[PDB]
Ligand binder design. Structure first.
Ligand code: TYD
Ligand code: MG
Ligand code: MG
Ligand code: MN
Length: 240
């Protein structure tokens, strides 16, 4: 397939169907969809189950269980890294169980990369609906080429050439960073790695959607490193 969509899933029974469905109904149909479930509850598994009937879905379920295992690594990064190793697509993109793809997302992103061989990483604008019907709408723009993606661009707004992954692994030893110190902003940390070698090219269109309302787990992670740290290191890096 031209595109490998890598989605992660953990206990979002009320939302995961809409997420999956938004991918399976894309106008661009030449993709494989990895559903990397991190050993979710019964309710979640049962919502996902019918979608496994779609011949494009490649479902993998971990055996992870308990606070030690959930806090040993940034789980989604480990899952994403696993999927990357199995991916057959020329282009790679990410999805989650709480994010919705707009119908022409894959089509528009694939066209951008097909058309511009010089661009390796692209990103679109993203929209979040704050609920309570809608009380607030937040848009994350995609107006400029950027060498400083961390915390400015979301997990779910990017597509890149597979070849990007080689470079990243060559320097850092892995693709996404599994260190649990980057649990809250794992996307930013992976974008930080990519930004050592590639700028992110914009698609001034809103192509993904989030809905939001306007623990022994938290207490067992290491101190969390933050955005500022990443942005300053890239500014010092001085690639742009
Ligand atoms: C907590 C956890 C999340 N995940 C997945 C669920 C989501 O697809 C992804 C991000 O988690 P999420 O809870 O959405 O974090 P955020 O606070 O950024 O919204 O990680 C796992 O795979 N394993 C886990 O143990
Ligand atoms: Mg061009
Ligand atoms: Mg996030
Ligand atoms: Mn989320």
């Amino acid at each position: 397939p031209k595109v490998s969509v890598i989605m992660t899933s953990y206990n979002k029974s009320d939302y995961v169907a809409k997420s999956i469905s938004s991918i399976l109904s894309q106008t661009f149909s030449d993709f494989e969809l990895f559903i990397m479930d991190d050993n979710s509850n019964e309710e979640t598994l049962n919502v996902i189950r019918p979608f496994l009937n779609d011949n494009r879905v490649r479902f993998y379920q971990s055996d992870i269980s308990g606070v030690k295992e959930r806090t040993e690594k940034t789980r989604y990064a480990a899952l994403i890294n696993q999927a990357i190793e199995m991916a057959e697509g020329e282009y790679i993109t990410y999805a989650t169980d709480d994010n919705i793809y707009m119908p022409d997302r894959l089509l528009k992103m694939v066209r951008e990369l097909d058309t511009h061989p010089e661009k390796a990483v692209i990103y679109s604008a993203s929209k979040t609906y704050h609920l309570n019907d809608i009380v607030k709408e937040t848009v994350r723009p995609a107006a400029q080429v950027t060498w400083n993606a961390p915390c400015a661009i979301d997990h779910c707004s990017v597509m890149h050439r597979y070849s990007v992954l080689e470079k990243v692994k060559e320097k850092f030893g892995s693709y996404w960073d599994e260190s649990p110190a980057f649990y809250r902003i794992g996307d930013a940390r992976f974008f930080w790695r990519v930004n050592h070698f590639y700028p992110f090219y914009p698609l001034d269109e809103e192509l993904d959607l989030n809905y939001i309302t306007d623990n022994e787990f938290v207490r067992n992670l290491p101190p969390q490193r933050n955005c500022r740290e990443l942005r300053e290191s890239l500014k010092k890096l001085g690639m742009g």
